[PDB]
Design a protein around this nucleic acid. Structure first.
Lengths: 548, 778, 479, 141
RNA sequence: UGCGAAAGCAGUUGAAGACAAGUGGCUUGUCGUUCGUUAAUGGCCU
């Protein structure tokens, strides 16, 4: 379910700006900021600050301080404006709002007197929230949601203090509860390998998912349904998925748990206090192109043993499905004993593979379609016959007739035995056009060359043939063109391939004029044998003879 | 939650007995000529002729009461042979019908409102394995019975006699004979006429049955003139006949097209001659002045005798098989069309028409499927030639033995029909030969019938040498699955003995309809895409991802693929992207698949599953090479690559099954397939066999063929339903009769089709004054 | 039973009756009656000529001008008409009565180039001569204009108004520099100027929001509510001389505007989809003053083209007894105020032809004969040959013929082998007839002359097809 | 029409096209005429376009097609495709016109990315011709 | 007739019974016969 994985304040901007993150720092005073600029003043700082936010303009910023307040700072001009200290316990993770979107004084004790992004624009006291520990601010219809260790879930909207929904959400101690990119859910992580996407319209867990690796820092990107989970003892953020018009690739949010890996873009080199190297360059989650690579949460190579029907007693109503051996022996124990016989202590002779192919399932010395085949059994059989044992007469006539070899066939141009190579170049469909092309541009020109040209027209696409033959040795093709001009339709279509491959100008005139005479007698034989192909009353008086 | 329920209607089920008929039609009317009692194989239909709807059906599975007569396994030749109007037991006393099938099973079926659940399943004694007919008048009903030679049955006339022994009908045994090659009954039933073949030559008799009145025989060597004493057997051979109700006139329609008229006393000869093919349909009027004639030309031709001339009816869009007038004053012509543009099935077409302007009232169809071969006793009608549509006279025993022993000794019996389902109104399209049949199975009839080629389907009756001018057969048409376009592709043939007669050539076009009309207008045509002389066999339509089902990608047996999307700036259909890998080999065993969000293109070539992307029409070779596998290779020659949803998948080959996961890029599971199928299919046919659900997978159908104790004429549907990518055999539904295809109707259900064409589904004081005034209303 | 089966630029090229009337000098520009342009005027030298929509020649004219006259313009009511000359004494006088002169008032002594009335007001008339000032005279008191509309750098030359916005007058000089004055202003400044480059040829306002100016070898558009250009077009040999606009007429284009550019062809753009021509039709040289009639010409609609030589091309589109009648009086009632209405009509279809009914009655021989006559159409012959090959047997269609009947078949395959769509099928035709009729040509040795002539021209055509195939092979190599 | 019978086939006014083409996805040698062809391909004017392209001579066609601009060679080749689509009776001397744009201009149409999309008339028409060329050579032999 | 592909690849090409005709008998041709092999100037309306 993953994506392309790599990389082993102002929450919408990025680089080339002044200062998008005047961000808080652990083991510092309160905060710092760096350019890849603007000031980082005192916002009634010097508290137990672990986070920091602003008015998203980098000129009216603040320092979120654990004193129940948020007083303004001056980051560009020098004239800070007044405020109002609302609570008196802890506001070290405070955040200003937009022009009347989402502001309430629920600092650390659930004291949610609603207000605006101002000190004097006050609203009703929505202080009916219980003892909560998970306070989130989302932009569905701007809403502060509380998940509580008295366990419950609720959401209120700061428009006219409209408590939207809520129930008894059994939320235990989790790791990372980010909002979802669709905004109607939240990925609330369970401890080791799990993160449940809970639909934040009714506080109900919609999909409780398992995690492929360790999930310690989960943050949902500006994507369709993609999040990044950074591991515990590393800066590696695995990119998984379960904002689509101009999908962001970097500078979405500032959350990780790596080696001081805050301000988390894809290219997260330019950090606030870290000043580290760079990472990924991947965009948001695609439609169905990323999921073909991102095979996370399940990694296995298995197959069934060809399960039959749920046994049907039809001895009075037989199916006419065979006059031969319908149900064959798919005995994996017999196949394992036969392969261990082939790679057993008789291996000095070719009888060790001949009698093993005999004592294996009913393959009639050349024939497939009794598919006694699991992938591991197949590749270990292929390894015990491709080891250090062109020798056997039963098995090496059974294996031109196999559609599955899968790229160990580079050896086929190097090994040079006549009849096994002939069966392999007529039957087995795994011998690439590179090997086909150099075996074609051999200049001994026999029925081996005829059969591989028949195979290149039987299996291999013309565009791949062209773009593979574009750049190769010119001496072989010019020597073969001179030989054939001195002294079959497979060779003539190969001539069409190479005489589209020639390009425009990179030849001479005498060899091509003799080739023009060769193709002149080609057009005359073509016209004369298609001509061969579509080739394939009473007058007034006479003098007659008759007997008397 | 899934179960078998066979629902919709089937064939009209006439007298499918070669020469064992003279009428072959018992679709009767009431004595108040307003409702039509027509039998089927699957129903009894009662039609209101003033509205052409069904006021009441009597279905052949809703009552075990009746369907104990016909619900068996191999003896499903229980066809229905005679309908009478009143209660036969009580003398004429109110209006409920009686019904005989082929075994002499007397049924007294109710006729108005809702039926009473006690049908008098009476049975006469001798009727064990026969019923030719019974013939009706006042009081006396006389049964024509058949016993067992030279392939000639024996016909006996017994009388149903039933006076006071109220629980037994007893036969009375009037007449006997042992030789019949052709026979016929009058239009009033009071007279019949047969032949006897009894050499110094063949002979013809005309007999009465209700009296001693007229019982005579004579050799037809006198009726055969010297020209047909001399020339060939198509001129010597009687094709059809007719008698009059009076008993003084016998029509013999000879196989050349001449219609002899002979008298009774003097036995003169009189010749009627317009028909060029053979003649199959001859009947007199009740007054006996007009002779109704229907032959292999598409015309209904009626002769006035005392001018010896004719009134025509030009385009009946088929082949007339039997016809008579049946109004008591003679206002209604009942007849049977057949329309042999598909030679596979004897798919007839019952209709009557008025005598006023010869307008047709209540064309009664069955579902007309498009098979690949003959089915089960599918003989061919008698023409002068052994053409591509039928056999000749001399090949009767030859072709019946050839077909019977071919089904005995054959192993190739697929005949898998391709259909479609309309997402506008959920009616199923039977794409006919150069045409369609839009069947709305909710009330088991049709709605219209559009021609789909610019051929010689309509404007000419096919005659003796033009029968081998077969029409351009369509293969399939694709719905845009918002229900907007018929994208049809058809192959076409030339007449033989021509140099251009070699190739079978290809043409596609595009049809738009609104929800108002039932026909489709032609937007545009494309003659041979992918270049000339290339099949366009597999074309896939798209979901609503791109432009609300505008994608249709055409493919090839060679392996080339083009993309085709509609547009509106060009108010026309055109293509988008181009690919033709010109392999110098070809293979018509190709499947395809496409992702429902529009990401992956799957070319299931001859055992290679090549993968293209959607966006750039090519093999996806990314910038990482970490299991971006865009080329599979399967175990053997596949026939389906099917995507149930974007994660997992089923591919089907000849020998086994395989399941694929693509997010987790591996294989999953496997089932056996060669233990089910031996050699039954042609290549590419598993695609039209199985079709996926939107959610719950597919239903792989076991093809079986029940052995003798070679296959016998018992057949199979032991279909086992699968759920969610090869997981559960949650239902083994057993059935005693064959199947051709299974489709998904959008209420998560699966409609299957029988060959005996029954569509079904596996799925999920003042009161006294008012009453007496109601009695005094009429 | 059923029946038997049967087997934009066109609007602007169904404009015809293009007649010519040569003047004695060039045609400056023209005019149209705004309430009903069933008459129109052209500005000949020392006379103005006025023509109808019916007789298509001069129905009235005035020729007691003393110098060459420049501008002819109807008032919006369409009763009187203005005319400015080279003398600079601009004359207004009543139309539909030429021999009276209402008032001839002098402008500046420079030649009054353009003079047009207010587009909605009926008593104020804009004049412009080469005095570098334009004037809004008032015809009630024509002794001094209300506005001395000054503020030009050089040569005010083409005036127009804004239609729905009254106080905005769009004048154009030979400086680029399209001015638009407010009539309540001081008459010395526009509120802004539009930056054309060339000297403007003339400007019209096609919207109350969008004007089009033309000058030099490309024309420009100008938005007036925001001072913006969205469009230019410059596909002309010389400068676009004159412009015209029309709204809501009978075409597959809702509203049109034409530009005429001294190069024969006049171009018909459209503000429906930003100014593309359907097709432009040429004329007999330097096209100076060209326009079609406005909207309410009501069917009959004229385009006129007065060239710089002076010839006017006019191309116009144009779409028993009482007792017996009382015997057959009830013929038109058609069922209005009574209960039910039947309708059972068969339709008189398109004209079925003799070859068509020959196919319908299997009259194949005379179908072939009706195919191979010069009176019938060539593509009709191709289609009937294709359709009867697809329908019937050519053997039984040719079962009894001889070479005197066969010769128009060969005589038309002589020219039909060179076709693109029927080449191989007419080759199949001659293939069948020579496949079964060698005995006829070996009895009568005549038609082998056409066989050998056919042979040499088909060797020419097979050489032509071969070289065309190898030229697209060149395209394939240089892909 | 009797609704107990089949409705009839018709084409109406369908747009007939085969499945090929798509649009949406100082002298010192000889002084041969250039600027009249430039103003001819400014407009689409048959008269002056014929008086520039009525040519028949080998060197004249060479010098004309090369000494014009390569920004008009695409639409000039498409106008010659229009000519061979309008008629193929007189095809001999104007096949030279069609071929020399492909001969003497080699790099420009290759550097142009969309050849077969905008050029969907010329090689599609010549392959509509050369489709039946095996059939035409079979028929003529 | 079988497979397969718009392709080639292998085979039937029998027998009995009855009848017809030419010469009791013989000789030539068929069969709305059991069995086996996969093998007739007569043409489309209102």
């Amino acid at each position: 379910d993953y994506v392309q994985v790599a990389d082993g304040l102002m929450v919408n901007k990025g680089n080339y700006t002044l200062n998008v993150i005047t961000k808080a720092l652990e083991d510092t005073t309160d905060t710092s900021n760096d350019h890849l600029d603007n000031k980082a003043y005192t916002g009634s700082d010097e508290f137990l600050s672990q986070y920091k936010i602003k008015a998203k303009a980098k000129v009216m910023s603040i320092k979120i301080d654990t004193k129940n307040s948020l007083v303004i700072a001056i980051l560009q001009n020098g004239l800070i404006e007044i405020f109002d200290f609302k609570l008196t316990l802890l506001h070290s993770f405070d955040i200003s709002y937009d022009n009347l979107k989402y502001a309430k004084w629920f600092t650390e004790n659930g004291t949610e007197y609603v207000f605006v992004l101002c000190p004097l624009q006050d609203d009703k006291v929505c202080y009916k929230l219980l003892e909560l520990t998970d306070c989130g601010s989302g932009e569905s219809s701007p809403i502060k949601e509380l998940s509580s260790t008295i366990i419950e879930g609720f959401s209120f909207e700061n428009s006219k203090l409209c408590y939207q929904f809520g129930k008894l959400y059994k939320l235990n101690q989790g790791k990372i509860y980010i909002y979802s990119l669709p905004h109607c859910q939240l990925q609330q992580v369970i401890e080791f390998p799990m993160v449940d996407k809970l639909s934040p319209g009714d506080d109900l867990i919609s999909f409780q998912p398992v995690s492929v690796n360790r999930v310690l820092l989960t943050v949902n990107n500006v994507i369709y349904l993609l999040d990044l989970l950074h591991c515990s003892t590393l800066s590696q953020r695995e990119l998984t998925h379960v904002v689509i018009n101009s999908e962001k690739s970097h500078n979405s949010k500032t959350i990780a748990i790596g080696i001081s890996t805050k301000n988390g873009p894809n290219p997260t080199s330019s950090l606030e206090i870290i000043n580290i190297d760079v990472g990924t360059n991947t965009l948001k989650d695609s439609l169905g192109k990323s999921f073909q690579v991102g095979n996370n949460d399940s990694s296995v190579i298995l197959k069934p043993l060809f399960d039959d029907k749920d046994i049907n007693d039809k001895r009075v109503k037989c199916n006419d499905v065979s006059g031969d051996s319908s149900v064959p022996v798919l005995h994996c124990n017999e196949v394992i004993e036969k392969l261990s016989a082939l790679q057993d202590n008789d291996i000095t002779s070719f009888d060790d593979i001949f009698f093993k192919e005999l004592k294996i399932k009913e393959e009639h010395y050349t024939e497939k379609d009794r598919y006694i085949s699991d992938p591991g059994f197949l590749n270990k059989v292929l390894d015990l016959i491709f080891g250090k044992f062109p020798k056997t007469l039963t098995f090496l006539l059974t294996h031109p007739l196999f559609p599955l070899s899968r790229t160990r066939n580079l050896l086929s141009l190097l090994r040079d035995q006549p009849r096994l190579f002939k069966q392999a170049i007529v039957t087995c469909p795994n011998l690439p056009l590179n090997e086909l092309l150099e075996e074609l541009f051999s200049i001994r020109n026999r029925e081996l060359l005829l059969d591989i040209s028949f195979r290149i027209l039987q299996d291999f696409t013309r565009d791949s043939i062209k773009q593979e033959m574009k750049k190769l040795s010119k001496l072989d093709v010019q020597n073969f063109i001179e030989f054939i001009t001195s002294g079959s339709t497979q060779l003539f279509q190969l001539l069409s391939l190479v005489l589209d491959s020639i390009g425009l100008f990179s030849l001479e005139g005498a060899l091509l004029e003799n080739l023009t005479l060769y193709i002149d007698k080609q057009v005359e034989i073509a016209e004369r044998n298609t001509e061969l192909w579509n080739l394939i009353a009473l007058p007034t008086y006479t003098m007659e003879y008759l007997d008397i | 939650q899934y179960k078998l329920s066979v629902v919709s209607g089937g064939k009209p089920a006439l007298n499918n007995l070669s020469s064992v008929t003279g009428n072959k039609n018992i679709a009767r009317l009431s004595q108040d000529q307003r409702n039509y009692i027509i039998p089927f194989n699957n129903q009894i239909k009662v039609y209101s002729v003033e509205t052409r709807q069904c006021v009441k059906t009597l279905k052949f599975a809703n009552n075990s009461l009746l369907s104990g007569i016909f619900l068996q396994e191999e003896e499903n030749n229980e066809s229905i042979v005679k309908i009478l109007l009143g209660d036969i037991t009580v003398p004429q006393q109110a209006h409920l019908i009686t019904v005989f099938t082929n075994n002499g099973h007397v049924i007294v079926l109710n006729y108005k409102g809702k039926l009473v659940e006690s049908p008098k399943h009476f049975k006469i004694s001798l009727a064990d394995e026969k019923l030719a007919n019974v013939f009706h008048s006042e009081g006396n009903y006389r049964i024509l019975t058949t016993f067992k030679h030279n392939s000639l049955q024996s016909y006996r006339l017994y009388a149903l006699t039933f006076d006071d022994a109220k629980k037994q009908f007893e036969v009375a045994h009037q007449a006997e004979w042992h030789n019949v090659i052709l026979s016929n009954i009058s239009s009033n039933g009071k007279l019949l006429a047969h032949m006897c073949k009894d050499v110094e030559h063949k002979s013809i008799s005309v007999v009465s049955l209700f009296d001693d009145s007229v019982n005579l025989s004579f050799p037809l060597g006198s009726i055969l003139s010297s020209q047909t004493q001399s020339l060939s057997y198509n001129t010597r051979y009687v094709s059809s006949m007719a008698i009059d109700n009076m008993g003084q006139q016998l029509a013999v329609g000879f196989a050349s097209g001449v219609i002899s008229i002979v008298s009774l006393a003097d036995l003169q000869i009189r010749l009627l001659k317009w028909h060029i093919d053979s003649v199959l349909s001859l009947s007199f009027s009740h007054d006996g002045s007009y002779l109704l004639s229907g032959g292999w030309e598409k015309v209904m031709s009626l002769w006035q005798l005392e001018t010896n001339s004719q009134q025509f009816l030009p385009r009946l869009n088929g082949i007339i098989i039997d016809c008579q007038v049946l109004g008591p004053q003679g206002n209604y012509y009942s007849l049977i069309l057949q329309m042999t543009e598909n030679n596979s099935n004897s798919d007839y077409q019952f209709l009557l028409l008025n005598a006023s302007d010869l307008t047709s009232k209540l064309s009664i169809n069955g579902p007309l499927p498009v098979f690949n071969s003959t089915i089960k006793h599918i003989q061919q009608p008698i023409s002068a030639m052994n053409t591509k549509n039928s056999n000749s006279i001399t090949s009767l025993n030859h072709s019946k033995k050839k077909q019977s022993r071919k089904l005995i000794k054959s192993r190739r019996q697929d005949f898998t029909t391709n259909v479609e389902i309309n997402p506008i109104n959920k009616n199923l399209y039977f794409p006919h030969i150069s045409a369609v049949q839009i069947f709305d199975f909710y009330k088991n009839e049709q709605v219209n019938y559009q021609y789909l080629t610019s051929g010689v389907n309509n404007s000419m009756g096919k005659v003796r040498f033009e029968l081998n001018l077969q029409d351009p057969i369509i293969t399939d048409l694709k719905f845009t699955k918002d229900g907007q376009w018929m994208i049809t592709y058809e192959i076409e043939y030339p007449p033989n003995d021509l140099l251009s007669s070699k190739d079978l050539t290809h043409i596609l076009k595009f049809w738009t309809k609104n929800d108002n009309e039932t026909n489709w207008n032609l937007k545009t045509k494309v003659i041979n895409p992918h270049g000339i002389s290339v099949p366009i066999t597999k074309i896939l339509p798209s979901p609503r991802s791109v432009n609300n089902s505008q994608g249709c990608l055409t493919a090839d047996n060679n392996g080339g693929l083009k993309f085709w999307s509609f547009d509106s700036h060009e108010s026309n259909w055109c293509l988008k992207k181009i690919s033709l890998p010109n392999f110098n080999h070809f293979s018509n065993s190709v499947s395809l698949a496409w992702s429902q969000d529009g990401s992956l293109i799957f070319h299931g070539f001859d055992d290679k599953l090549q993968i293209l992307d959607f966006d750039t029409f090519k093999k996806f070779e990314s910038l990482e090479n970490t299991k971006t596998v865009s080329e599979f290779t399967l175990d053997s020659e596949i026939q389906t690559v099917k995507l149930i949803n974007d994660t997992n998948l089923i591919v089907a080959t000849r020998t086994t099954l395989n399941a694929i996961n693509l997010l987790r890029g591996q294989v999953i599971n496997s089932f056996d397939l060669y233990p089910f199928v031996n050699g039954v299919y042609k290549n590419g046919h598993m695609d039209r066999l199985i079709t996926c659900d939107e959610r719950t997978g597919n239903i792989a159908l076991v093809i079986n063929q029940q052995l003798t104790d070679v296959p016998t004429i018992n057949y199979k549907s032991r279909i086992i339903i699968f759920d969610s990518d090869l997981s559960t055999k949650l239902g083994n539904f057993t059935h005693h009769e064959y199947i051709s295809w299974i489709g998904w109707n959008y209420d998560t259900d699966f409609i299957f089709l029988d060959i005996e064409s029954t569509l079904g589904v596996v799925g999920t004081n003042s009161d006294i004054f008012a009453e007496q005034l109601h009695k005094l209303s009429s | 039973s059923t029946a038997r089966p049967r087997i934009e630029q066109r609007y602007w090229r169904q404009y015809t009756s293009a007649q010519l009337v040569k003047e004695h000098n060039s045609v400056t520009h023209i005019s149209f009656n705004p309430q009903h342009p069933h008459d129109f005027a052209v500005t000949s030298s020392t006379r103005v000529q006025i023509f109808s929509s019916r007789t298509r020649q001069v129905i009235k004219t005035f020729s007691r001008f003393k110098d060459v006259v420049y501008s002819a313009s109807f008032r919006s009511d369409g009763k009187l008409l203005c005319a400015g000359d080279a003398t600079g004494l601009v004359s207004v006088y009543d139309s539909y009565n030429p021999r009276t002169i209402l008032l001839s008032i002098n402008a500046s002594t420079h030649p009054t180039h353009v003079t047009k009335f207010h587009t909605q007001d009926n008593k104020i008339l804009a004049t412009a001569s080469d005095d570098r000032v334009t004037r809004l005279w008032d015809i009630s008191n024509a002794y001094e204009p209300q506005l001395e509309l000054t503020g030009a750098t050089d040569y005010v030359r083409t005036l127009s108004f804004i239609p729905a916005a009254p106080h905005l007058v769009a004048t154009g000089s030979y400086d680029g520099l399209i001015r638009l004055y407010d009539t309540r202003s001081s008459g010395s400044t526009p509120i802004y100027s539009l930056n054309h480059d060339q000297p403007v040829e003339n400007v019209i306002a096609v919207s109350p929001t969008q004007i089009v100016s033309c000058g030099g070898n490309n024309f420009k558009v100008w938005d007036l509510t925001s001072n913006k250009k969205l469009y230019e077009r410059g596909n002309f040999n010389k400068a676009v001389t004159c412009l015209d606009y029309v709204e809501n007429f009978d075409s597959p284009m809702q509203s049109a505007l034409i530009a005429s550019s001294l190069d024969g062809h006049v171009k018909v753009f459209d503000p429906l989809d930003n100014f593309q021509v359907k097709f432009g039709w040429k004329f007999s040289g330097p096209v100076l003053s060209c326009a079609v009639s406005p909207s309410t010409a009501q069917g009959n609609r004229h385009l006129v083209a007065g060239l710089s030589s002076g010839l006017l091309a006019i191309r116009t589109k144009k779409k028993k007894s009482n007792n017996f009648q009382r015997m057959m009086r009830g013929s038109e009632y058609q069922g209005d105020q009574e209960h039910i209405i039947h309708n059972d009509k068969v339709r008189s279809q398109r004209r079925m032809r003799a070859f068509e009914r020959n196919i319908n009655q299997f009259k194949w021989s005379e179908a072939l004969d009706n195919a191979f006559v010069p009176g019938m159409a060539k593509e009709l012959t191709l289609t009937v040959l294709q359709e009867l090959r697809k329908r019937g047997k050519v053997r039984v269609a040719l079962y009894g013929r001889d070479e005197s009947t066969l010769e128009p078949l060969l005589n038309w395959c002589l020219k039909g082998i060179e076709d693109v769509r029927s080449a191989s099928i007419v080759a199949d035709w001659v293939a069948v007839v020579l496949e079964l009729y060698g005995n006829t040509l070996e009895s009568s040795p005549v038609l082998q002359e056409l066989m050998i002539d056919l042979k040499t021209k088909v060797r020419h055509e097979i050489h032509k097809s071969k070289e065309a195939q190898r030229i697209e092979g060149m395209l394939q190599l240089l892909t | 029409k009797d609704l107990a019978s089949a409705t009839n086939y018709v084409e109406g006014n369908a747009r007939v096209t085969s499945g090929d083409n798509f649009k949406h996805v100082t002298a010192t040698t000889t002084g041969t005429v250039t600027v009249i062809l430039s103003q001819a391909l400014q407009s689409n004017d048959h008269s002056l376009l014929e008086t520039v392209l009525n040519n028949r001579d080998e060197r004249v066609i060479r010098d004309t097609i090369f000494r014009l601009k390569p920004a008009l060679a695409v639409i000039l080749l498409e106008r010659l495709a229009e000519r061979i689509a309008r008629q193929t009776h007189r095809q001999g001397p104007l096949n030279v016109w069609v071929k020399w744009c492909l001969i003497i201009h080699g790099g420009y149409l290759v550097s142009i990315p969309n050849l077969m999309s905008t050029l969907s008339s010329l090689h599609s028409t010549l392959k509509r011709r050369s489709d039946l060329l095996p059939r035409l050579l079979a028929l003529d032999a």
